[PDB]
Tab-separated table of C-alpha atoms and ligand atoms in Angstrom:
chain	number	residue	atom	x	y	z
A	280	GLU	CA	0.431	-0.358	-0.103
A	281	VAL	CA	2.500	2.692	0.435
A	282	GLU	CA	6.283	3.644	-0.520
A	283	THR	CA	9.010	5.301	0.915
A	284	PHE	CA	11.249	6.757	-1.672
A	285	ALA	CA	15.086	8.206	-1.104
A	286	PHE	CA	15.432	12.292	-3.079
A	287	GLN	CA	17.753	12.564	-5.416
A	288	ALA	CA	20.496	13.910	-3.405
A	289	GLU	CA	20.673	16.828	-4.812
A	290	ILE	CA	16.440	17.279	-4.727
A	291	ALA	CA	17.471	16.504	-0.979
A	292	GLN	CA	20.026	19.377	-0.310
A	293	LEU	CA	17.614	21.792	-2.048
A	294	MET	CA	14.797	21.352	0.244
A	295	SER	CA	16.901	22.012	2.670
A	296	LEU	CA	18.929	25.247	1.915
A	297	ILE	CA	14.462	26.094	1.718
A	298	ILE	CA	14.145	24.486	5.222
A	299	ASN	CA	17.277	25.474	7.363
A	300	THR	CA	17.893	29.486	5.049
A	301	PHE	CA	16.913	32.382	7.279
A	302	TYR	CA	14.999	33.969	4.528
A	303	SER	CA	12.600	36.366	5.864
A	304	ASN	CA	10.496	36.572	2.422
A	305	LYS	CA	8.263	33.567	2.631
A	306	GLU	CA	5.500	34.562	1.163
A	307	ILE	CA	6.441	33.986	-2.122
A	308	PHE	CA	4.921	30.422	-2.273
A	309	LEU	CA	2.108	30.980	-2.156
A	310	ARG	CA	2.523	32.312	-6.196
A	311	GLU	CA	4.946	29.427	-6.965
A	312	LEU	CA	1.793	26.690	-6.262
A	313	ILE	CA	-0.123	29.012	-7.509
A	314	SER	CA	1.788	29.390	-11.178
A	315	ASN	CA	2.547	25.907	-11.252
A	316	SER	CA	-1.194	25.601	-11.403
A	317	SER	CA	-1.937	27.752	-14.069
A	318	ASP	CA	0.515	26.611	-16.022
A	319	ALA	CA	-0.835	22.705	-14.873
A	320	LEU	CA	-5.200	24.886	-16.437
A	321	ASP	CA	-3.156	25.791	-19.352
A	322	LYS	CA	-1.908	22.224	-20.295
A	323	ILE	CA	-5.508	20.801	-20.411
A	324	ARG	CA	-7.212	23.579	-21.692
A	325	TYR	CA	-4.198	23.009	-24.748
A	326	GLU	CA	-5.238	19.525	-24.671
A	327	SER	CA	-8.827	19.879	-25.235
A	328	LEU	CA	-8.283	22.299	-27.614
A	329	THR	CA	-8.002	19.615	-29.700
A	330	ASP	CA	-10.082	16.432	-27.564
A	331	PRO	CA	-12.741	18.331	-26.108
A	332	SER	CA	-13.073	14.486	-24.120
A	333	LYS	CA	-10.325	15.600	-22.222
A	334	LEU	CA	-12.160	17.927	-20.049
A	335	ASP	CA	-15.081	14.505	-19.265
A	336	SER	CA	-13.152	14.717	-16.357
A	337	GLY	CA	-15.040	18.436	-15.479
A	338	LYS	CA	-14.652	21.570	-17.646
A	339	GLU	CA	-14.172	24.205	-15.263
A	340	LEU	CA	-10.773	25.707	-14.945
A	341	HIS	CA	-10.463	26.760	-12.183
A	342	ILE	CA	-7.687	27.552	-8.297
A	343	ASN	CA	-8.816	27.577	-5.279
A	344	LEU	CA	-7.594	28.386	-1.506
A	345	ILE	CA	-8.694	26.442	1.274
A	346	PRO	CA	-7.745	27.356	4.852
A	347	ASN	CA	-8.902	25.349	8.039
A	348	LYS	CA	-7.925	27.067	11.127
A	349	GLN	CA	-8.359	22.630	12.871
A	350	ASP	CA	-5.901	20.908	10.818
A	351	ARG	CA	-3.932	24.302	10.175
A	352	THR	CA	-4.050	23.296	6.302
A	353	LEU	CA	-3.782	25.435	3.822
A	354	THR	CA	-4.779	23.262	0.502
A	355	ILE	CA	-4.354	24.450	-2.866
A	356	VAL	CA	-7.250	22.391	-5.519
A	357	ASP	CA	-6.459	22.818	-8.874
A	358	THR	CA	-8.324	20.886	-11.854
A	359	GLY	CA	-5.259	20.856	-14.394
A	360	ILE	CA	-4.357	17.901	-16.145
A	361	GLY	CA	-2.331	16.328	-12.637
A	362	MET	CA	0.180	14.110	-12.202
A	363	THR	CA	1.024	10.177	-13.995
A	364	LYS	CA	2.040	8.386	-10.935
A	365	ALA	CA	5.864	8.716	-12.579
A	366	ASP	CA	6.045	11.790	-12.932
A	367	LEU	CA	5.134	12.625	-9.359
A	368	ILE	CA	8.057	9.774	-8.679
A	369	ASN	CA	10.144	12.011	-10.807
A	370	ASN	CA	10.169	14.804	-8.560
A	371	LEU	CA	6.164	16.218	-9.597
A	372	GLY	CA	7.318	16.484	-12.585
A	373	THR	CA	9.685	19.489	-12.564
A	374	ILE	CA	13.737	18.706	-14.049
A	375	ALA	CA	14.487	19.713	-10.496
A	376	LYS	CA	18.139	18.308	-10.552
A	377	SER	CA	18.971	20.731	-13.143
A	378	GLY	CA	16.806	23.629	-11.981
A	379	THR	CA	18.552	23.182	-9.059
A	380	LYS	CA	21.887	23.258	-10.255
A	381	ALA	CA	20.995	26.363	-11.695
A	382	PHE	CA	19.977	27.584	-9.083
A	383	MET	CA	21.796	27.237	-6.226
A	384	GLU	CA	24.860	29.009	-8.769
A	385	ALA	CA	22.469	31.666	-8.992
A	386	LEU	CA	22.040	31.949	-5.401
A	387	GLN	CA	26.188	31.683	-5.198
A	388	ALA	CA	26.010	34.218	-8.217
A	389	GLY	CA	23.808	36.526	-5.660
A	390	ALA	CA	20.205	35.167	-6.422
A	391	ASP	CA	17.758	34.974	-3.779
A	392	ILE	CA	14.868	32.193	-3.298
A	393	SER	CA	12.561	34.359	-4.126
A	394	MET	CA	13.966	33.590	-7.118
A	395	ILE	CA	13.302	30.057	-7.080
A	396	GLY	CA	10.214	29.701	-10.115
A	397	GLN	CA	12.263	31.024	-12.786
A	398	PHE	CA	14.782	27.524	-12.460
A	399	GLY	CA	11.784	25.186	-12.286
A	400	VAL	CA	11.344	24.519	-9.013
A	401	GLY	CA	8.925	26.565	-7.082
A	402	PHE	CA	7.261	24.022	-5.983
A	403	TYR	CA	9.136	22.782	-2.638
A	404	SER	CA	9.087	26.939	-2.130
A	405	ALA	CA	5.678	25.679	-0.158
A	406	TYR	CA	9.170	23.727	2.775
A	407	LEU	CA	9.327	27.382	4.050
A	408	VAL	CA	5.702	27.186	5.315
A	409	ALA	CA	5.542	24.089	5.704
A	410	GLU	CA	6.512	21.309	7.662
A	411	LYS	CA	4.207	18.626	5.807
A	412	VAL	CA	3.037	19.059	2.387
A	413	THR	CA	0.674	15.808	0.617
A	414	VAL	CA	0.194	16.234	-2.701
A	415	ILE	CA	-2.788	14.658	-4.185
A	416	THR	CA	-2.972	14.347	-7.528
A	417	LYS	CA	-5.233	12.719	-10.735
A	418	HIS	CA	-4.401	12.624	-14.209
A	419	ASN	CA	-7.154	10.643	-17.104
A	420	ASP	CA	-4.320	8.784	-18.151
A	421	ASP	CA	-4.490	6.741	-14.430
A	422	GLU	CA	-6.010	6.575	-10.660
A	423	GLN	CA	-5.338	8.947	-8.134
A	424	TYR	CA	-1.893	9.770	-5.726
A	425	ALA	CA	-0.903	11.117	-2.645
A	426	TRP	CA	3.058	12.430	-2.582
A	427	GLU	CA	3.964	12.723	0.371
A	428	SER	CA	6.348	14.199	2.398
A	429	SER	CA	8.324	15.833	5.633
A	430	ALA	CA	11.313	16.294	3.945
A	431	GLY	CA	14.173	14.238	5.975
A	432	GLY	CA	15.836	12.971	2.587
A	433	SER	CA	12.075	10.477	1.713
A	434	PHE	CA	9.076	11.527	-0.211
A	435	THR	CA	5.835	8.511	0.016
A	436	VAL	CA	3.345	7.252	-2.655
A	437	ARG	CA	0.119	5.287	-2.357
A	438	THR	CA	-2.965	4.990	-4.182
A	439	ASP	CA	-5.611	7.760	-2.539
A	440	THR	CA	-8.102	6.412	-0.972
A	441	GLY	CA	-10.134	9.898	-0.676
A	442	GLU	CA	-12.540	12.273	-1.553
A	443	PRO	CA	-12.798	11.262	-6.005
A	444	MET	CA	-11.118	14.889	-7.468
A	445	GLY	CA	-11.936	14.266	-10.632
A	446	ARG	CA	-8.809	15.888	-12.398
A	447	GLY	CA	-6.197	17.788	-10.358
A	448	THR	CA	-3.721	18.303	-8.293
A	449	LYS	CA	-4.612	19.729	-4.350
A	450	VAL	CA	-1.112	20.444	-2.646
A	451	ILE	CA	-2.116	20.664	1.515
A	452	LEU	CA	0.069	22.284	3.006
A	453	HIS	CA	0.094	21.216	6.440
A	454	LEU	CA	1.918	24.625	8.212
A	455	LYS	CA	4.564	25.394	11.233
A	456	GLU	CA	3.144	26.666	14.367
A	457	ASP	CA	4.628	29.700	13.672
A	458	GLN	CA	3.161	30.330	9.774
A	459	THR	CA	-1.154	30.643	11.093
A	460	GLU	CA	-0.647	34.023	9.336
A	461	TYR	CA	-0.780	32.369	5.780
A	462	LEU	CA	-3.604	30.998	6.820
A	463	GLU	CA	-5.919	34.125	7.539
A	464	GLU	CA	-8.801	35.340	4.933
A	465	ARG	CA	-6.687	39.324	5.431
A	466	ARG	CA	-3.449	37.997	4.686
A	467	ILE	CA	-3.607	35.229	1.701
A	468	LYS	CA	-6.068	37.647	0.093
A	469	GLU	CA	-2.931	40.318	0.100
A	470	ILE	CA	-0.884	38.207	-0.945
A	471	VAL	CA	-2.635	37.224	-4.419
A	472	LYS	CA	-3.177	40.766	-4.966
A	473	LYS	CA	0.377	41.347	-4.397
A	474	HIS	CA	1.578	38.342	-6.789
A	475	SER	CA	-0.975	36.240	-8.221
A	476	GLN	CA	-2.641	39.898	-9.610
A	477	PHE	CA	-2.779	38.204	-14.023
A	478	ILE	CA	-3.240	34.501	-13.870
A	479	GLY	CA	-5.597	33.878	-16.108
A	480	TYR	CA	-7.910	31.208	-14.433
A	481	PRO	CA	-10.673	32.399	-11.628
A	482	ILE	CA	-8.587	32.317	-7.759
A	483	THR	CA	-11.971	31.384	-4.930
A	484	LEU	CA	-10.602	31.382	-1.380
A	485	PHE	CA	-12.850	30.180	0.856
A	486	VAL	CA	-14.006	31.460	3.670
A	487	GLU	CA	-13.982	29.395	7.415
A	488	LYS	CA	-17.504	28.672	10.456
B	596	NL8	C1	1.226	18.338	-13.390
B	596	NL8	N1	1.354	19.575	-12.999
B	596	NL8	C2	1.337	20.098	-11.836
B	596	NL8	O1	-0.101	18.455	-11.610
B	596	NL8	C3	1.442	20.224	-10.520
B	596	NL8	C4	2.349	19.871	-9.318
B	596	NL8	C5	2.646	21.145	-8.223
B	596	NL8	C6	1.213	21.548	-8.175
B	596	NL8	O2	1.538	22.781	-6.842
B	596	NL8	C7	0.533	21.758	-8.888
B	596	NL8	C8	-0.315	21.253	-10.621
B	596	NL8	O3	-0.496	21.067	-10.637
B	596	NL8	C9	2.154	20.609	-13.097
B	596	NL8	C10	4.259	19.956	-13.166
B	596	NL8	C11	4.773	20.930	-12.656
B	596	NL8	C12	5.160	22.575	-13.052
B	596	NL8	C13	5.551	23.409	-13.188
B	596	NL8	N2	5.706	24.188	-13.303
B	596	NL8	O4	6.898	23.050	-13.025
B	596	NL8	C14	3.705	23.082	-12.764
B	596	NL8	C15	1.831	22.077	-12.660
B	597	CL	CL1	16.720	17.631	-14.473
């Protein structure tokens, strides 16, 4: 039922750098994850232009932001193309080994952590704010999978028996205890307006009871 994998050494080092570096501008995680969602939504849109049946798993293309203060989670849900099991295991669809090389050279040559997305590895910015990240994904060509990692050099993959998603990717951020500002409506709104104001899909911020 649960498979445990080692990160490639370069990815483990990327994650360690994100977790251990003193860097105050953590809010950029949300821009990076919304960017990934937008890119996934563009991919299923483009495939649907020539094969409308690709949207049989859901026609609506959008992004939901779901804070839950009871669970201390921020969830980013998109209805994009989703990931196969293979692409989950292969660094969540990224060229993360080569991207990490380029990013670490850029940080040595004066870049900062906010530029992570320019190297194709923006997903890993989740670990600025999350102690654990859970990714639930569903691609038309595959079953629904759950990826998870608390860093420390490993991740797990299992077939997800949870709530069916139709198609797309859900990133569940289990926030660090000192990062609960990212569950507050006003703070999320501020970050979306500051860094994600030109994303071409609706971004709905859910509210809480
Ligand atoms: C397919 N795919 C996803 O399903 C996906 C991965 C991570 C994420 O936070 C959101 C996603 O939709 C995904 C993978 C990689 C990128 C990227 N921009 O490098 C974008 C999208
Ligand atoms: Cl690569």
